[PDB]
Amino acid sequence: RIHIGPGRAFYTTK
């Protein structure tokens, strides 16, 4: 479960 950025957005799994 991949998070991105300062808002920690949901982006992809694995």
Epitope: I2, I4, G5, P6, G7, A9, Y11, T12
Partner: antibody
Framework: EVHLVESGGGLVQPGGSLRLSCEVS????????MSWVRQAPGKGLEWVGF??????????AYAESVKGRFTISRDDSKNTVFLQMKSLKTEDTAVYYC?????????????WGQGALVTVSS | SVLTQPPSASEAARKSVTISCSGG????????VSWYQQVPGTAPKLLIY???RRASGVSDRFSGSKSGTSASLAINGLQSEDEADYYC???????????FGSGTRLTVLG
């Protein structure tokens, strides 16, 4: 096309309280991960905290240096995220920026506001 | 536990620069690096996210890579617009906070 417009900046004495607003247009606010980063005069960048979408927790988390003095909250009705500050120190004097972020069609997008200056001083 | 960048960098117009960032396994190691550009006065702008993906509407002169516990932003066809501060950024696991690099002031010669 996207814009993040913040406000409520100003001057407030040590010990005081203050509320920043960030108003987001050109974005589905519902699905936007909102956060705040600050930059103290002549220094580097420091993350303040974020708030999740309603479809997740709706919950916020915070940098330890503001934990419990700062509250992030949001109003999906009014397309706006808030950064409530209480118990301010001089060390809190900075330009505060919010960020909006979505993920549409496997692509990430993160837009920043122009920032608002908060001066803590007597 | 901090992300460290060289303070300054420099190169001539039309050429290419590399800016590095080194963290530890708890931030860059475990997650992914993003890069920001900041021209003094203005706000920062996202350039790269998830190690190597380009932000919506950004010159392909910019590109990013991640090797192990370090990370690297590269810039081609160097224009004068391009001098700014550059910040890497990652989530850190032990601190539980989004952490930004020291920052690097690129200057363009010639």
């Amino acid at each position: 096309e996207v814009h993040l417009v913040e406000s409520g900046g100003g001057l407030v004495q040590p010990g005081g309280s203050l509320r920043l607003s960030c108003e987001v247009s050109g974005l589905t606010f519902s699905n936007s991960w909102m956060s705040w980063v600050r930059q103290a005069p002549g220094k580097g960048l420091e993350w303040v905290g974020f708030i999740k979408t309603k479809a997740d927790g709706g919950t916020a988390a915070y940098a330890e240096s503001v934990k419990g003095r700062f509250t992030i909250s949001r109003d999906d009705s009014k397309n706006t995220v808030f950064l409530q500050m209480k118990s301010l120190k001089t060390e809190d004097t900075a330009v505060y920026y919010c960020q909006g972020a979505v993920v549409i069609s496997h692509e990430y997008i993160e837009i920043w506001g122009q920032g608002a200056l908060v001066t803590v001083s007597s | 536990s901090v992300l460290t960048q060289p303070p300054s960098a420099s190169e001539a117009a039309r050429k290419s620069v590399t800016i590095s960032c080194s963290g530890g396994s708890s931030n860059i190691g475990d997650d992914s690096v993003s890069w920001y550009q900041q021209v003094p006065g203005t706000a920062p702008k996202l350039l790269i996210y998830y190690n190597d993906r380009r932000a919506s509407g950004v010159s392909d002169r910019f590109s990013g890579s991640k090797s192990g516990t370090s990370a690297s932003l590269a810039i081609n066809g160097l224009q004068s617009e391009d001098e700014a501060d550059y910040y890497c950024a990652a989530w850190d696991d032990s601190l539980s906070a989004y952490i930004f690099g020291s920052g690097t002031r690129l200057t363009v010669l010639g």
